[PDB]
Amino acid sequence: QDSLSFGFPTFPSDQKNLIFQGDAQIKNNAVQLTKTDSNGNPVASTVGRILFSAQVHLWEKSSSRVANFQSQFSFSLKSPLSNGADGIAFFIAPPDTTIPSGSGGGLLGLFAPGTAQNTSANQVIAVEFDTFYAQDSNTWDPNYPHIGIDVNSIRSVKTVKWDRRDGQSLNVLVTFNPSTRNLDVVATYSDGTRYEVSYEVDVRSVLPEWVRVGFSAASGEQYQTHTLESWSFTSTLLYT
Amino acid sequence: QDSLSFGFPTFPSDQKNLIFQGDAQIKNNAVQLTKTDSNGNPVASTVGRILFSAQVHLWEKSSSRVANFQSQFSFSLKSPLSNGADGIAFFIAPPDTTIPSGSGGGLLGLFAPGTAQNTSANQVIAVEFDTFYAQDSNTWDPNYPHIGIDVNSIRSVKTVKWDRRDGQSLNVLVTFNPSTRNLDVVATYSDGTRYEVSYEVDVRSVLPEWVRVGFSAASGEQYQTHTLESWSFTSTLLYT
Ligand SMILES: CO[C@H]1O[C@H](CO)[C@@H](O)[C@H](O[C@H]2O[C@H](CO)[C@@H](O)[C@H](O)[C@@H]2O)[C@@H]1O
Ligand SMILES: CO[C@H]1O[C@H](CO)[C@@H](O)[C@H](O[C@H]2O[C@H](CO)[C@@H](O)[C@H](O)[C@@H]2O)[C@@H]1O
Ligand SMILES: [Ca+2]
Ligand SMILES: [Ca+2]
Ligand SMILES: [Mn+2]
Ligand SMILES: [Mn+2]
Hey, which residues 18-77 in chain A have their CB within 8 Å of chain B? Predict the structure, then answer.
């Protein structure tokens, strides 16, 4: 289909169109990307991702069209630790994408250690909300919590300072306009605090015509829950 | 998802989200539900169906919600003859639906011979565009071409006389309103000729909470092409 849209105001346990990978599962009408014990407390060494089952037609070589898409979602992070890790990301990748071996912790379940910073070895666009930046392990990160745009590498092509707020929901709108090739990210907390970051990228040179969209999160030695609360997505092929 | 929508203005050959059953295949940017020869001419004894891969949440027992839905599509029928058969139908059924054994010809690939008129043995709602009504084989049909609403039986609960026009595209709009429980069908030819048929039905007592939507067509001894040219669908779970 040239156009596709879907909306999850909440996430009931009865799901049919979501692909669950790793430890991701539904609990209390929300998606818990990372594992939690019986009491709902976060645990270390966990990775989980979800993908919508239907493939999205991102661009069409034959017709020279590229999709205009928008992804709106909200999530919350919670941890009794002073340095919860590692973060959550909205991503777009080839339909057969699976969790890379050893992609835990700071790799957010998106990249393999050996090629995490090799742009020619990956096919993924992601918007990360990174809460762990220890310069000793996450050497590629700026020294503060941040929102980053990742294009085929864990070392973001761009980042902006972000404030992690325990237990508070962050509303995010990610948009891509094929006319300007601008990928815009706008995130807000309920008190009006706003974060914005944009990057120009030709998705045709990074991703295949058909892709899947979803979320990924991970916790290494440090941990926190990564709770996806709602998600709506829409895409439509347009003439460029 | 509480809401889902998709649109196929045309049908390019590289499809990813369509389930093809029987003889259905893409040819010339359109879906040919029934088999055709090398020169594109219709052949006898053929059945074909397509279903969208993502499941639709028609109703939810927990929230007591029921979805409204709208399906818009256009198709054309062509035959060297005139008594083209057998017809095409838009249908909704359980996700694991497959072509029933011996459902060719007048059964439109939707019902099994032994239970075609047994409402307690089927789970399907369909809007049929029936062009063959010979009483020797289609005893359940009125004596003329027609559009009918089928609820668990090949014997339509409601029909309206219809005119078959070789090679002309018929634009159809099917809508279900959960508030009134009315399933409305409006079909029109380019010159404005309009056909309307409606029926009140509680989808909750006929179909499971999750379903798949699609099209089916068949040709027994008489034949014609059943070409699906475009299709858009949208559904939203609502409180009533
Ligand atoms: C206390 O953990 C920090 O220090 C440890 C010892 O140097 C590191 O092993 C550890 O790295 C792992 O956890 C972080 C945070 O979850 C993660 O980003 C990294 O990829 C490792 O999984 C961390 O630096
Ligand atoms: C000439 O075909 C008509 O008469 C035949 C002899 O009685 C029938 O077998 C035949 O029925 C089959 O074809 C029709 C039209 O395709 C179909 O509706 C029916 O299910 C049988 O397949 C038809 O009545
Ligand atoms: Ca990090
Ligand atoms: Ca018939
Ligand atoms: Mn980072
Ligand atoms: Mn009929």
Answer: 53-55, 57, 60, 62
